[PDB]
From a paper:
Previous studies showed that proper introduction of disulfide bonds could stabilize the flexible region of target proteins and reduce the conformational entropy by locking the protein into single desired conformation. Here we developed a comprehensive disulfide bond prediction algorithm that not just increased the success rate of predictions but also improved the quality of crystallized target proteins. We applied our method on two proteins which were previously determined to high resolution and frequently used as fusion partners for GPCR crystallization, cytochrome b562 (BRIL) and Flavodoxin, and verified our prediction by solving the crystal structures of the wild type (WT) proteins and mutants. The theoretical and experimental results both indicated that with relatively lower values of conformational entropy, proteins would be more stable and readily crystallized to higher diffraction resolution.
The continued disulfide omitted electron densities of the side chains suggested that the disulfide bonds are successfully formed in all crystallized mutants, which are T9C-A36C, A20C-Q25C, V16C-A29C, and K27C-A79C in BRIL and N14C-C93, A43C-L74C, and C102-R125C in Flavodoxin, respectively. The WT and disulfide engineered Flavodoxin structures were determined to high-resolution of 1.20–1.55 Å with B-factors in the range of 16.15–19.24 Å2. For Flavodoxin, the reduced B-factors for R125C mutant indicated that the disulfide bond further stabilizes the structure.
Author numbering: 1 to 148
Write the structure that this text describes.
């Protein structure tokens, strides 16, 4: 079967829950899903062997757009991950009280495109408690699968 990698940076658990929800959706559809906390990964060759890569990251920063801390090293070395020609999609939790709502997702997408990835679906941005967005999360995973 096709193999999917999900890597998530999450501090309060929201993007982690989102990743777990996406993983079950893909696994139910027949994907072999490898889900990893970004804190545990190294960037070099990270995407090797994977037909689909899903990257999740929350947004931070006192008065700038900053990526979740565990994701920053992966972003900083994203050019070594094997993203060229890779089918990728991005997701993240945020808070719409911030103007740059899920700004980290946008930043990861833009760099992926420079690096030659194929963005298979527009990034998923979740407001507030992601358990109150379960339908949106499952639907997005479904749409990602249908777009590859
Ligand atoms: C200092 C600070 C800055 C934040 N900045 C943003 C932001 O710019 N855009 C956004 O969408 N959310 C912002 N947030 C909201 C967090 O991303 C939100 O709490 C999210 O649910 C955390 O997801 P996680 O538990 O997966 O880490 C900010 C939160 C804090 C504390």
């Amino acid at each position: 079967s096709a193999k999917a990698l999900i890597v998530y940076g999450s501090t309060t658990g929201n993007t982690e829950y989102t990743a777990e929800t996406i993983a079950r959706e893909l696994a139910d559809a027949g994907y072999e899903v490898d889900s990893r906390d970004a804190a545990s990964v190294e960037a070099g060759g990270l995407f090797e062997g994977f037909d689909l890569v899903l990257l999740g990251c929350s947004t931070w920063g006192d008065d700038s757009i900053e990526l979740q801390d565990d994701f920053i090293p992966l972003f900083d070395s994203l050019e070594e991950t094997g993203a060229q020609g890779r089918k990728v999609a991005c997701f993240g939790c945020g808070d719409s009280s911030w103007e740059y709502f899920c700004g980290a997702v946008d930043a990861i997408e833009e760099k992926l495109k420079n690096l030659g990835a194929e963005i298979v679906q527009d990034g998923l941005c979740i407001d507030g408690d992601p358990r109150a967005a379960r339908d949106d999360i499952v639907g997005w995973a479904h749409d990602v699968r249908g777009a590859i």
